[PDB]
């Protein structure tokens, strides 16, 4: 009947898991930040030459 | 290329078939 008093354990688990989800979002963002930018820099350094020179 | 010639031919053919059906 939605009485949290006797659902305390499950509610605490849910809250802790949500906090862990936010923490995981933060850590994943910082970890994401080879990167496409660096790889494009490398490819620019060594470009494909489909023509003559 | 576009398909404007094909569309003109398609309309011609459709109208011809419709007329043949009619008459």
């Amino acid at each position: 009947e939605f009485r949290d008093d006797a659902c305390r354990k499950e509610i605490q688990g849910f809250l802790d898991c949500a906090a862990r989800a936010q923490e995981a979002r933060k850590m994943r963002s910082i970890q994401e930040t080879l990167l496409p930018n660096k790889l494009n820099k490398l490819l620019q350094r060594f470009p494909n030459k489909p023509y003559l020179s | 290329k576009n398909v404007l010639k094909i569309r003109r031919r398609k309309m011609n053919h459709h109208k011809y078939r419709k007329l043949v059906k009619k008459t």
């Binding site: 939605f2 949290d4 008093d5 509610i11 849910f14 809250l15 949500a18 989800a21 936010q22 979002r25 | -």
Partner: protein, 208 residues
Amino acid sequence: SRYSPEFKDPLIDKEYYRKPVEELTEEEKYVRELKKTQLIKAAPAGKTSSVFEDPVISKFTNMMMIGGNKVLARSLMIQTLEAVKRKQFEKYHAASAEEQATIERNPYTIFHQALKNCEPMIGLVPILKGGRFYQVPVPLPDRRRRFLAMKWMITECRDKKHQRTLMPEKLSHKLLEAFHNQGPVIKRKHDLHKMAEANRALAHYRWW
């Protein structure tokens, strides 16, 4: 903002500054030494070092304020606390010693526990998958939970059902009911939980 980005919000806490130097980790000592050369925002006129200061009650007063009437909001808050304490004292005196041990008389504790009971664990948010928004259930962060509890309390007190009943008495009665896990505010929390459970099937619509 008249404060440049280099300005930091002040840290008003006597114990923090009176902490012994030997008890400071290297990072804490670095933080103090850095703050020694940082501009600090002037202390706002709301919070002080007073030991009786309560951030939760201050925020409740601010939320209850209407049109910059801080004096009136504080008056209502103190009247509510006094009414709660008087009612608890009356119950304590009229009650037998067996239950006097459990009867609570601290209005601040009563208020904190009432808000905590009113806090909703899960809310409903519009989440969009494919171009349609649905009221998907979602956990509510701590700030949102506290804010929702306080706002529900204030709105329920402000309802027009209670006529000729002053806000002090209304809020004291509602706070006591919430402390005892009853009343319209807890009913609203349970309604939110019931709606979230009813829409439980849409949880996957969340992407975060």
